Design a binder for this molecule. Sequence first.
Ligand SMILES: [Zn+2]
Length: 25
Amino acid sequence: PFACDICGRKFARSXXXXXXXXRKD
Ligand SMILES: [Zn+2]
């Protein structure tokens, strides 16, 4: 795994890394 800064949570690698929703909301 790897963690986000902005979430403080663990995730995989995942071509949905389409979460670039850290540009607009
Ligand atoms: Zn995140």
